[PDB]
Design a binder for this molecule. Structure first.
Ligand SMILES: [Co+2]
Ligand SMILES: [Co+2]
Lengths: 471, 471
């Protein structure tokens, strides 16, 4: 019995400590002040890229830290001059709350690249390539690296062949590399090997694939080893003092585990040690935002991500039917199916979760939320599988909207000029496209932020004094 | 490029939640009251064995919980009637502070088996087979399972061939199985595969090997997968709510990661879920005893286990030279070498660590502790490599003891009758061999314990009230 493994080679590593690590472990509340001190070492560690922007950090900066996201980007570009900066961008949704007209996507990408972003990991919650298409083109126009993304999930319609097809569609829209995202740590070892190998066998060894796995279920570092045996080019990790739990596998652990296998990373262990210790000293200040579960494999049976489960709980707590949780968890699968089995990541997870609670309370689709209606009617794009025509009809007969099947942005009219005018009437607006984008992405937060931005970035973390006083 | 892997098969699992998990995560303070509620589910989970005795639990029971270790054993045998109970026994040292005469080993093993112990994992801190020989024979006489142990470590003298030789010596003394112990999580993936495969190739596939790895460095779950590909029969894990950090890899994670690989475990996921939730509800009460580091790979460079490092720190704090820590960490390697490269596990780690601090302060072996002197003079047994003759001489010229090279217990005279007499003069002594053993193993604690035992077992964990009041 034998297993074919890739030839001895160097495996690239993407550090997530500056973005996804704290987004996953301390609600994206990491203050810029607590990160800049590790930039010099991070820049000289030897990482393939440094994820430090995008995701929920834009929202967090303006909503909780009174920090300008564009200033964070500029500072990181300046303190890590020799590194490839990387961000996560939700396609046509950008970092916003809805799909935007193509010109807004163009502006955003152009300004991101202009301010220093090198690698753009573009993804769509439902894996609809059409929603990633324009952002990808904008990234290529800016001469930057376009990383098309495949959100991994487990469902009756997701298969290896299905993932290989998506990889092809991403390569067809000019992807420079393919990212396999596993936000819920659902990727097991064998599937990791099979999917990576199938993509490499189908499109060629030159096809660059970056694997992003969280450690929530505790099985993905083994998946990382299997992905490396299958030939994956780069794997995402988080410095050891900011890893595990709903976060990611440890950078140092992944580097150390390869000794003697023929595979290696070229990270500087001394630099890694300094970055570790830097965050180990700072992490305690964020205890009020930490999660309390290091390993949870329940999703392999329920299909429900811990985050999604908590939300439904709170929704079943604030109403009075905490007794129907076992019923809700049984309803979710049915709602997911009806919606076409979309991956259960934001926002699909909230939409499916909330609708599941309604069906239990008010009754079988008796009342559909505005979001669920939009998903069923195709306003978020195509689903991995065909949506239940019966539930679709009900959505149409309850929202008054006609079902659509083409890229949603095709219906969106130009809005930049409209956004610029409205933004320019806000006290604090600095007249840059960056600020207009801030208003376009977060209309209800931009006002307050522009007004207080002059006060400078803050921190919602405990102070050393508060740490001591508490101890 | 290919890698040979074992044929599809069932992999056995040993659950550590009742012994090593809490010894490693909350200073062995887990109260019997907090464990008995999960016994029924643990007994029906499908584990190959349940480690629930030995190690530091005997000391903890009588020193901190006013609990009779023998009563804990009897209760576990009664609540888990269909399971193979397993314990850790430090050979000729038993669970005590020194080597004992062979008749004490006979008594202990006989009473352990009589009270219900099924599998005895016998080990010696310096991997000297002669110190394991008699316990192993006693285990075989009692008709129980003798698991000879190899303490894994990394040193210039430890090699695959060296481990294969030890495995042979263990099999020659009647071992029913071989345990590979990696208390510091030093076993990387390739070495795990190479050592397991070499033992299987040399002594036959019928040779049973159980792998015990902690997760301290964060690389051992990958090692577990490699060990399984190499053909390991059983791997030790800890239920997910009591895992990771200086503890072990998660039971559920290890079981889930095998899906589709051809390997499988036959654990009942529902029973595992109940055991998880049981301990998740109880673990918060032990926060005052939790460690604060989930992943630490520094040992791959320093050879110093976190626990060993902390101790030296405190010793360098309580004296005034916290400035010489970088010097101490540089001295340890030299002391280890001089001692013959013994694995850095208790008590060798403390002995080497303390001596390292002296050499830095008072000077190069200017003053040797009584323990270090005994190691250098062979009173703990043979070292993996020859000890520095120059340091040996100094030990002899400073302790007045002649160096020995034969099994230390060969010099020990009968002591049972002496132990019985002394023990019988303690208020509370119940006249059983069990109590005499308690006195023989912990002379200075037995008095206090026998006097308060009637008050019943206690807990040093926070009460629900204290948990709430604190929150
Ligand atoms: Co992520
Ligand atoms: Co252990």
């Amino acid at each position: 019995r034998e297993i074919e493994v890739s030839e001895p080679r160097e495996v690239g590593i993407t550090e997530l400590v500056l973005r996804d690590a704290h987004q996953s472990l301390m609600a994206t509340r990491m203050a810029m002040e607590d990160m800049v001190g590790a930039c010099a070492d991070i820049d000289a560690a030897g990482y393939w890229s440094v994820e430090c922007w995008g995701g929920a950090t834009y929202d967090s900066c303006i909503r909780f830290l009174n920090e300008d996201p564009w200033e964070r980007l500029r500072t990181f570009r300046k303190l890590m001059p020799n590194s490839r900066l990387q961000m996560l961008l939700r396609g046509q949704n950008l970092l916003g709350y809805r799909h935007y007209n193509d010109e807004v996507v163009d502006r955003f990408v152009d300004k991101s690249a202009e301010n220093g972003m090198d690698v753009f990991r573009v993804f769509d919650a439902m894996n609809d390539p059409r929603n990633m298409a324009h952002a990808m083109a904008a990234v290529k126009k800016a001469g930057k690296h376009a990383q098309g993304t495949i959100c991994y999930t487990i469902s009756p319609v997701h298969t290896v062949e299905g993932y290989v097809k998506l990889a092809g569609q991403l390569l067809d829209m000019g992807a420079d590399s393919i990212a396999l995202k596993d936000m819920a740590a659902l990727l097991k070892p064998q599937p990791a090997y099979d999917i990576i190998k199938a993509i490499k066998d189908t499109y060629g060894q030159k096809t660059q694939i970056n694997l992003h796995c969280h450690s929530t279920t505790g099985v993905t570092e083994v998946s990382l080893m299997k992905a490396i045996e299958a030939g994956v080019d780069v794997v995402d990790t988080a410095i050891s003092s900011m890893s595990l739990g709903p976060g990611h596998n440890p950078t140092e652990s992944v580097a150390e585990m390869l000794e003697g296998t023929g595979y290696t990373t070229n990270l500087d262990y001394d630099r890694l040690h300094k970055i570790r210790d830097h965050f180990k000293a700072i992490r305690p200040k964020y205890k009020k935002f930490e999660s309390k579960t290091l390993v949870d494999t329940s999703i392999f049976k329920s299909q429900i991500p811990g985050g999604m489960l908590s939300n439904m709980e709170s929704q079943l707590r604030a109403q009075g039917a905490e007794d129907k949780m076992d019923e809700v968890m049984a309803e979710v699968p049915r709602v997911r199916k009806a919606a076409g089995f979309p991956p259960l990541v934001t926002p699909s997870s909230q939409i499916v979760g909330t609708q599941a609670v309604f069906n239990v309370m008010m009754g079988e689709y008796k009342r559909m939320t505005g979001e669920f209606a939009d998903i069923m009617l195709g306003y978020y794009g195509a689903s991995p599988a065909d949506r239940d025509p019966k539930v679709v009809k009900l959505a149409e007969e309850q929202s008054g909207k006609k079902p659509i099947t083409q890229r949603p942005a095709d219906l969106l009219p130009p809005e930049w000029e409209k956004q610029s005018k409205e933004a320019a009437t806000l006290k604090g607006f600095n007249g840059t496209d960056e600020d207009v984008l801030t208003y376009a992405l977060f209309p209800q937060v931009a006002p307050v932020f522009f007004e207080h931005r002059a006060e400078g970035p803050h921190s919602v973390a405990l102070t050393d004094a508060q740490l001591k006083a508490e101890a």
